[PDB]
Ligand SMILES: OC[C@H]1O[C@@](CO)(O[C@H]2O[C@H](CO)[C@@H](O)[C@H](O)[C@H]2O)[C@@H](O)[C@@H]1O
């Protein structure tokens with residue numbers, strides 16, 4: 001144990017990026033208004049579109065009556081690039097507008113361009129959400145402005161932040177940009193934690209709900225280590241940031257992340273029956289990292305248990321056949337799926 005900090009907010013969570021270890025949490029599954037943190041998913045989808053080369057940063061997109069702070073009523077009052085219909089804008093510029101400025105018009109223009117329509121784009125957002133295991137998240141807009149059935153949780157936001165960083169790292173990299181210039185005016189990132197001297201913060205997204213208070217998804221690094229924090233429903237902007245700051249600081253100070261089973265490493269080699277190979281490598285795959293109190297590597301010990309006494313073909317790469325137990329001081333602290341590292345087909 002290490003005593004978890006008190007957190008002056010509605011919900012929060014602190015997650016290690018490599019291990020997935022939840023170091024601290026309160027109300028982490030309470031459904032709440034995500035607001036602009038919705039834009040994290042918006043950007044996830046745009047990032048996937050770019051990575052798949054379905055769109056390019058240099059592409060020019062035409063703005064529709066859609067994306068007009070005016071002839072779209074819901075845009076009024078909201079943060080905005082000030083696009084007008086007929087404008088020709090860079091994907092790159094819109095992408096930065098979503099990310100750095102949280103332009104709600106940028107959101108609409110890009111979604112129309114990626115998916116044809118807002119409804120199709122929202123379909124993509126909720127598609128990934130299910131894929132990623134965001135069991136308590138449903139999106140109802142491209143920008144995160146007020147809608148009836150729209151919620152997330154601190155836990156789902158962290159999982160989503162983790163996927164952004166992992167799956168579309170070129171899209172994540174834009175989130176640390178302190179400003180960008182559009183129409184000759186510089187637009188600042190409203191993530192004040194980017195300016196923190198006591199942390200290396202490089203993301204991610206701020207949000208401010210109807211009544212519930214102030215939100216932040218943040219991620220930071222320190223040596224080999226990366227943490228993600230979510231704070232939902234802080235009462236002030238200031239508390240929003242310092243609670244996030246103090247969670248992150250606590251996690252790095254007192255914990256380390258280590259990787260006793262590297263991806264693509266063999267943990268056990270086991271006999272297989274009735275296959276075109278007599279033996280097969282088993283490992284952890286990507287799941288091979290654990291977050292433990294500092295100083296405790298010395299005392300970390302890994303064990304395996306197979307779920308069947310004897311392994312039979314056919315086997316596929318990624319299949320689970322047992323259990324990695326991670327033990328600490330001879331007490332059991334984590335368990336992970338023991339996976340097949342190579343296909344082996346039934347003999348012939
Ligand atoms: O958004 C593209 C737009 O930004 C500028 C600077 O205003 O380019 C910056 O961002 C580019 C990536 O999108 C970088 O390639 C470039 O080095 C950087 O200056 C404009 O040049 C561009 O129109």
Ligand SMILES: OC[C@H]1O[C@@](CO)(O[C@H]2O[C@H](CO)[C@@H](O)[C@H](O)[C@H]2O)[C@@H](O)[C@@H]1O
Nearest residue numbers: 192193194195196197198199241242245
């Ligand atoms: O991390 C807080 C630490 O950094 C300083 C500047 O060195 O404040 C920066 O970060 C704050 C939020 O973390 C911002 O509110 C502030 O505007 C920014 O300069 C110090 O004030 C503080 O000790």
